[PDB]
Amino acid sequence: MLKTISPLISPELLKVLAEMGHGDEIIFSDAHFPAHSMGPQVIRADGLLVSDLLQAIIPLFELDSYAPPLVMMAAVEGDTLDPEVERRYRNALSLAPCPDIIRINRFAFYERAQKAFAIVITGERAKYGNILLKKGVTP
Amino acid sequence: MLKTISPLISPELLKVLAEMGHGDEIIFSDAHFPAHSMGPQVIRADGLLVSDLLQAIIPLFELDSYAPPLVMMAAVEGDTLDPEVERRYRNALSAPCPDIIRINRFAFYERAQKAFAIVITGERAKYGNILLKKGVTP
Amino acid sequence: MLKTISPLISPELLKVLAEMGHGDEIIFSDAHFPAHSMGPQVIRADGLLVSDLLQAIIPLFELDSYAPPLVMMAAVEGDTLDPEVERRYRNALSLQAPCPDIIRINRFAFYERAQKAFAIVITGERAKYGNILLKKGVTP
Amino acid sequence: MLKTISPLISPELLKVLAEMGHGDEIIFSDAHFPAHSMGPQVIRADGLLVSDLLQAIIPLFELDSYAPPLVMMAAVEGDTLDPEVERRYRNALSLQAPCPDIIRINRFAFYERAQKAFAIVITGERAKYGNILLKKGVTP
Amino acid sequence: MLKTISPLISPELLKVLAEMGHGDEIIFSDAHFPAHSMGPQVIRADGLLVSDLLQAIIPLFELDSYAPPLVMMAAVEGDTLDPEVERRYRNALSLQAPCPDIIRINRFAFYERAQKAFAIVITGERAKYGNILLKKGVTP
Amino acid sequence: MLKTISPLISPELLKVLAEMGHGDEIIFSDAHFPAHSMGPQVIRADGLLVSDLLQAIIPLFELDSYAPPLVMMAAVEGDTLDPEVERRYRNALSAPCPDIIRINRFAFYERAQKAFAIVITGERAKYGNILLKKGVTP
Amino acid sequence: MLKTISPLISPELLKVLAEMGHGDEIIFSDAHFPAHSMGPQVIRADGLLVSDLLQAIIPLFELDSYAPPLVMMAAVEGDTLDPEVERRYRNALSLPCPDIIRINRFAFYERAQKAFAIVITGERAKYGNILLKKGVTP
Amino acid sequence: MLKTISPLISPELLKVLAEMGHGDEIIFSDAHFPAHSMGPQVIRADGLLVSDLLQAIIPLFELDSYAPPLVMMAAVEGDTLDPEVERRYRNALSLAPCPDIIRINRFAFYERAQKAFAIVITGERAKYGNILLKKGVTP
Amino acid sequence: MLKTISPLISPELLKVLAEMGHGDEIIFSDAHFPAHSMGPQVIRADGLLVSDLLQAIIPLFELDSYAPPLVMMAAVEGDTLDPEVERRYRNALSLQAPCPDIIRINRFAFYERAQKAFAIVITGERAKYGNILLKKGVTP
Amino acid sequence: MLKTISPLISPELLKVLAEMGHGDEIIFSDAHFPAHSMGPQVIRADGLLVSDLLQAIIPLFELDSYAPPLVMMAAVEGDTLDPEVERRYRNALSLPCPDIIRINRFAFYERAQKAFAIVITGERAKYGNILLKKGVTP
């Protein structure tokens, strides 16, 4: 734990976040995500909701302006998604407003998770609660 | 995650709990515990309370009936404990929850140095550290 | 071991099952499978039957409903497969609710698929074609 | 697996048994033993009985004749030990020739001794005091 | 780098600072300190002043209040401390509130304590006796 | 060592043989084989002949009946083989010893690169390298 | 620290510069460079300006005369460089020729994936990345 | 394999032998020795007799003159030892004669094997075929 | 060090030389070669001349006779080789019999081959183009 | 290699010397020293004379002024040193004081177990071992 920094961010994630450079991507997945088979280093955040890390990390993480900074997974046809999830993610990320969030199909998302800098799997239970953040040029 | 098992328990902690044998000790510490300098493997559980992990693990973890299975830290001289902590931990570990005994910071740290693992949590209370001793799984 | 969880599941396997997410695949091979050269981590369960493991894991493992969750190996040219195997695998998998249909794929495609699995658990099953792949779903 | 060798013996255990020399000790513990904190390398054999392993290993493992080759744990104050355990352990060990007498030592001295063992194989034996230590001899 | 947190703190140091608990100790040494032979993990901070790093971490690092949290090295017989080093350090450490009195211990006593430190950050401070140890407290 | 098992087989090779599955390939090379630059794990057996290891392993190692289980190296153009080698290897691997097929140095090395392991021996003969493919243990 | 050698160079960087041979390329990046994602080993030099290292390094590092020895990043189209960055760099390097080649952001990343090492500095100036190519030490 | 050097010495043993300095000790044990539980690095020489390595290594290994260079294990009371074993060891080591060989009790031998530089376990089947060599000042 | 074998050969190099098989290649480069970026394991031999190391290993290293076993680097346009380097190398390599003709290939071709070498020994040879590659043959 | 720095110093030795701080001790041993048995990290410098390294190292390495900075091995009782060894060493070091302390063979080993590193050279001279203690870099 450290002062002025959300105690919800583990020491290892703190390191990962700092090591990230312009353009690096990090995923905060829901609890159902196959994080461990993607390839990048995985960090567990089992007792937390994605919205928890988002609000904890946003004052530290500059979002990329050179590319879509926020990406989520699109529900497969014949499946159900929750409208509220994306709503609080935006609220958690609004320091003030945050860029629009774009959804790509689940496979496209995995494909990109495979090249990500790291993956943080949380306890988010809602379906399709996975979100990718692309880092910008930290001022 | 997994069905019928608390998702608050990370897979690595699930492995640790399963590997532990009779007499093995694990510590669930508060956020201020010097967990990483004790020696045993450390598992972070930052967003959770000690009482959260205690209740999640108890239906899987039989407590030792051959020796004191629950050990907490005695307040250092010129300092006092928060009454709310121990009572909350007992509640979480309830068969009845065995009695809890206190031992000075020296003896607690000496045992922490030799514990099977240390799970550091987001528990903010002072003296929120607790040592559990595994018994024989029935 | 732990209470409420089958003792047949090793600590490492419990970790593996918990780490797996939606779509991840895990193989429970018979004793003849070339598990160690496939690529993924290998957990040995020598002396144990695949069916005994399936029955122990099924109450915690959600099978994928987004795609066929069960894949077995088709017999190779000239071989006859023992119907007793798939019969007791489905039974073990039907512990709480009947299990989905099992599909069969060419031995080469099975290996190519084993090369991408999350993990491989090699058991004591001595019958040929006793390998079965499981695909995890979304834990309800 | 391999021909002429029990399939119940994992590859790692076969290596371990072959590496052991005269006087080296290996423990086959029950499922309750604190094997992972003792120190020596641990091989898991979850779901398997100690007696089933002993019967599989005895034809390859020479028991030491220079010192007591079999050590078991004495029950702790208040506990009763099941005579059925030591009974089937000796039977399994008597596969080709009757096995030596088994000695019992205090739980603390057993652990102190486990800390020096070559390896520890934790099995699926669920009975208490199902731990047994074997000391290798000179392969004739 | 990150926003909010000073970029003078390398990602590895940030992780270290966060893992430290109440009572844990960290050394920010001058360029002449035998950092690598003490025992704990070392983080190089060549080119940076100790006072640069103290200012960077003070907003995140609560000092121990259960014991003297600031310790520097006493000058060895024949040498004499440069009070300006302490001034700079004191000002960096007093950016939020007056820092506790800074205690000075003998060279060898300092090394002994370093052997048990959580980590050691060797900087570019070229002034003699530019070493300082910080003890962590209960984070508010 | 171990009773009923050849002491010529090191514990590590004993582990390797046991881990190998159907279709897995292992090479027993002569002393001049570039074993350490192929890729797979290498096990030294310097004082032994390939025929020594072949005979020791055969009572434990069932050979593949689904594909060519024995592969040797074809002599490079402008070079010739020593007749005594292949015949000695067949003798060592005798159920009858399946037929042996030759493949150029390129195809042999390509497979060596992907083999499960390589056991380099003290076999001094030229082209004394042989690749065994494991079958289904009965 | 060592006499005659700039104390700004960490022992690890000293080792890296010494291990580099003719043609090897090293990058001293700004704080925003995605160094850890490229592939080569990374040396953190947080808080230091690129120009500080260049000045510290140049007396020991011979620049390649067989190929352009200095490469920088061209500004993203439509954007412009801060002329002070390169002026500061040219001075630190004590720079007849050689000139500084400028390659596009991604072309720069491509070449950085194959570099000997990447030293990420505390340089906050936009496009402060510079790649140096070692020559033959006189 | 290398020219002029016994092909019976594996590459790793070659390295160990060379890394050894004045006073370092190395054990060539029989096949019954508990080499792997002693502590030092172990090298397998399964198809060889101790006498094989001895004759292969002696032209490379200078024996210590500052201390007893050759030590073997004494048979426990109530056990049998082979007179020929020590005989050929001496013959193998005689390049020309080799120092006397002294026997210490089995436990004393293990105790010393625990601090040795390395242990080479061979296929020597004879009981008490273990021998320790102490390296001298290589000329 | 050892007797019989030249003490100029570090224990790690001796091991490497012995593990090499027919066709394996090793580079003894000059002090300016980019040894560490090629890919293979590197052994430092600072201070020693390439000709010093060639004399040391020739008695133990059979050259390949199935292909040109000796390869050096051609001078880059603008440069010119110092024939005395080759003389020294030739004499060291001819201590037991006339060494095969020494072939010279382009700089980049040499690097390409180095990426696939068994190992690289970078020495203190400060003359340009002091690099030489050896291909191992069937040891008599 | 690096300009201004002796090419005799390997990159790893350069790193080690740079990491050493005030009071740390480094040993440059002769070829007969049991370096790998002592405990500290070992850097091979086969073929090089101790005096060659000392000459290469001294311009970068400040000797301790707070404690005797040079220690050597006293000859085994009844034996004698070759005066040329130390004369050669004193010259390489460009050596008012300090004097060279001589400790018995085993006392030397004891201190070598706690040294920062051991560089084993090709020095064949009896008792060519020398321990240097680092001071405060000016």
Ligand SMILES: C[C@@H]1O[C@@H](O)[C@@H](O)[C@H](O)[C@@H]1O
């Ligand atoms: C079908 C999808 O599968 C994975 O991507 C999960 O992380 C999602 O939440 C969803 O269940």
Ligand SMILES: C[C@@H]1O[C@@H](O)[C@@H](O)[C@H](O)[C@@H]1O
């Ligand atoms: C004095 C004690 O120090 C550590 O053990 C903390 O984890 C406790 O909560 C308490 O503050």
Ligand SMILES: C[C@@H]1O[C@@H](O)[C@@H](O)[C@H](O)[C@@H]1O
């Ligand atoms: C031909 C097949 O080969 C492997 O896949 C074995 O695991 C099967 O049981 C069967 O023998």
Ligand SMILES: C[C@@H]1O[C@@H](O)[C@@H](O)[C@H](O)[C@@H]1O
């Ligand atoms: C009291 C004893 O504790 C451990 O040694 C267990 O392995 C035993 O079975 C018994 O429960």
Ligand SMILES: C[C@@H]1O[C@@H](O)[C@@H](O)[C@H](O)[C@@H]1O
């Ligand atoms: C004598 C002392 O030695 C070390 O502790 C240095 O870090 C100090 O600055 C001082 O030079």
Ligand SMILES: C[C@@H]1O[C@@H](O)[C@@H](O)[C@H](O)[C@@H]1O
């Ligand atoms: C040309 C071939 O090269 C290697 O494969 C050797 O192992 C063979 O015996 C033969 O010499």
Ligand SMILES: C[C@@H]1O[C@@H](O)[C@@H](O)[C@H](O)[C@@H]1O
């Ligand atoms: C757009 C570019 O992104 C990275 O390459 C940074 O290192 C540059 O300075 C610039 O910000």
Ligand SMILES: C[C@@H]1O[C@@H](O)[C@@H](O)[C@H](O)[C@@H]1O
């Ligand atoms: C009793 C002794 O035990 C070990 O020391 C063996 O290596 C000996 O050969 C002998 O059998």
Ligand SMILES: C[C@@H]1O[C@@H](O)[C@@H](O)[C@H](O)[C@@H]1O
């Ligand atoms: C131009 C060449 O570059 C490298 O290959 C050096 O090793 C050569 O000696 C030469 O300087």
Ligand SMILES: C[C@@H]1O[C@@H](O)[C@@H](O)[C@H](O)[C@@H]1O
């Ligand atoms: C007797 C001594 O043994 C070692 O310390 C050698 O390094 C010395 O040079 C001497 O030979």
